[PDB]
Amino acid sequence: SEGRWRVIPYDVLPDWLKDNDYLLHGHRPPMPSFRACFKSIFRIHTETGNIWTHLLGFVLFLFLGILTMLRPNMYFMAPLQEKVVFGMFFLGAVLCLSFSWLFHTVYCHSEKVSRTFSKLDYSGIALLIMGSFVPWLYYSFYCSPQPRLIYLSIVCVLGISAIIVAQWDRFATPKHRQTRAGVFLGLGLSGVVPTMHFTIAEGFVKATTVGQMGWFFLMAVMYITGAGLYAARIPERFFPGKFDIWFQSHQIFHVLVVAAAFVHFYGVSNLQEFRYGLEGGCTDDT
Amino acid sequence: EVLLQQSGPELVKPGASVRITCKASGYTFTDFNMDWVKQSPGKSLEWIGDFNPNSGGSIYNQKFKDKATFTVDKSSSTAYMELRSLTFEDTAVYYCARETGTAWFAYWGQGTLVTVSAA
Amino acid sequence: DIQMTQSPASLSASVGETVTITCRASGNIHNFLAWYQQKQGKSPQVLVYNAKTLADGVPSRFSGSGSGTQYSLKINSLQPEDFGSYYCQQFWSTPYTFGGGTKLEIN
Ligand SMILES: [Zn+2]
């Protein structure tokens, strides 16, 4: 009978918990106990779905990660390089989803705890992007070492920079958040150059379907749709107070992140099989 | 702003059963629990118990198990406490205090003085 | 039943000086603590909740700190209207309990 708490409306929330105006009732009150925060996972409030979505997604991708790391070395041509190349993706996805549900659980703890776990959440998003670009770059430029190393270095530089700019303090000033968006913008848009490079180095038609670039376009559209649903905060923008617990904008963005990471894995795996069975050579027919 | 108005003073005889009222204004009545506090003269505070007006439930301290009884009027948005079998140790100021999410009290009533003496 | 032991019984200071009131809980209340002020005849008013959160409207000279079983309310630049009895309460375990209180006089 300890750690009792009820939900509260949006009006009586502290400033550091007023991060969405269209969620009227059902908010957790500030509770400076990790025990109560973790216990609240099994209770209904505004953050229940946002916790469970990426909790299940983390379990799912951890399952896929270790299971794929157990695939025997026979099925891979270069097992060591290709497995660490896949380990980057599965690690970044696991860390991203773990940081996400951890932040959403301890979100009501205190201002500083929510602050630090918010930074971890942004760093997790950057890690997921870097992880997603490691195996795609490997299996798209597997016969071209120079551009693979170049694009990998650019993405890693912008990813590391994205993590660092969002972790250290004194950059929370109004005029440094511009470069906060700038580094993440260079990170996000860094995939346009190698995509067209791949679509030009080989035929557009062979890359559209058998090159699995339509699946990369599918996940990109889903990522942009999720970011738009997030910034607009719909459907709760038009029906305020009706999507408090379920089907808020943040929950469908979490689901879209999971689905986009899954279709990325499927598109990469088809880029694998098409590259194992076919292609590889350059200038000889015989 | 939230306001909690309590009933006026009470002078009763040993064995009587008095009731304290607590009218709440300025907020949605069912949104928060409401606790009751006793303060005997020249002493510290004592938590009598809390009342959930959403479920109409209540939890009582062991030291006030049979003496306190909480009731509600969700229509008039007014919570009541009842003290029966009053003895001389019950002469005290009784407050109603509203919680927010956890059990810290930001809003209090003005207090009701219950005095007990035969005459 | 967690027992809250407040300290001291009473203390005095002059305007502008700093005072500190300590509170020890017989068990861990996990920062579920509140500090209240009560002037003579008046009802108590909340000063701090969640161990270190300043309540809305409270002057900045009040500040709560501590954790586990040890907590402290500090008052900078004492003001004449700061006299009265200060109380602590734990709202972690039921039944919720209060400290013995601390009487504060100003000279
Ligand atoms: Zn999230």
Author numbering:
A (entry chain A): 0, 89 to 373
B (entry chain H): 1 to 119
C (entry chain L): 1 to 107
Excerpt from the publication:
Human AdipoR1 and AdipoR2 belong to the progestin and adipoQ receptor family, and serve as the receptors for the antidiabetic adipokine, adiponectin. AdipoR1 activates the AMP-activated protein kinase (AMPK)2–4 pathways, while AdipoR2 activates the peroxisome proliferator-activated receptor-α (PPAR-α)5,6 pathways leading to the increased expression of uncoupling protein 2 (UCP2). Thereby, they regulate glucose and lipid metabolism, inflammation, and oxidative stress in vivo. Human AdipoR1 and AdipoR2 contain seven-transmembrane (7TM) domains, with an internal N terminus and an external C terminus, which is the opposite configuration to that of G protein-coupled receptors.
We previously analyzed our diffraction data set for AdipoR1(D208), with one molecule of AdipoR1 in the asymmetric unit. As we now have the reliable structures of both the authentic closed and open forms for AdipoR1(A208), we reanalyzed the previous AdipoR1(D208) diffraction data set, and refined the structure as a mixture of the closed and open forms, assuming the dual conformations for residues 250–279. The closed- and open-form structures of AdipoR1(D208) refined on the assumption of the dual closed-open conformation are quite similar to those of molecules A/B and C, respectively, of AdipoR1(A208). The r.m.s.d. values for the main-chain Cα atoms are 1.006 and 0.705 Å for the closed form of AdipoR1(D208) against molecules A and B, respectively, of AdipoR1(A208), and 0.806 Å for the open form of AdipoR1(D208) against molecule C of AdipoR1(A208). The electron densities corresponding to both of the closed- and open-form polypeptide chains, positioned distinctly between the two forms, were certainly observed for the dual-conformational region of AdipoR1(D208). In the SA Fo–Fc omit maps for AdipoR1(D208), the electron densities corresponding to Leu274–Val280 in the M2 region were continuously observed along both the inward-bent and straight 310-helical structures in the closed and open forms, respectively, which unambiguously confirms the dual closed-open conformation. Correspondingly, in the SA Fo–Fc omit map of AdipoR1(D208) for the closed form, the electron densities of ICL2 and the NT region of helix V are clear, particularly for the residues interacting with the main body of the protein. Correspondingly, in the SA Fo–Fc omit map of AdipoR1(D208) for the open form, the electron densities for ICL2 are much less intensively observed, as compared with those in the closed form. On the other hand, in the SA Fo–Fc omit map of AdipoR1(D208) for the open form, the electron densities for the M1 region (Ala268–Gly269–Val270–Phe271–Leu272) of helix V are clear. Therefore, AdipoR1 adopts both the closed and open forms, probably in equilibrium, and their interconversion may be related to the signaling mechanism.
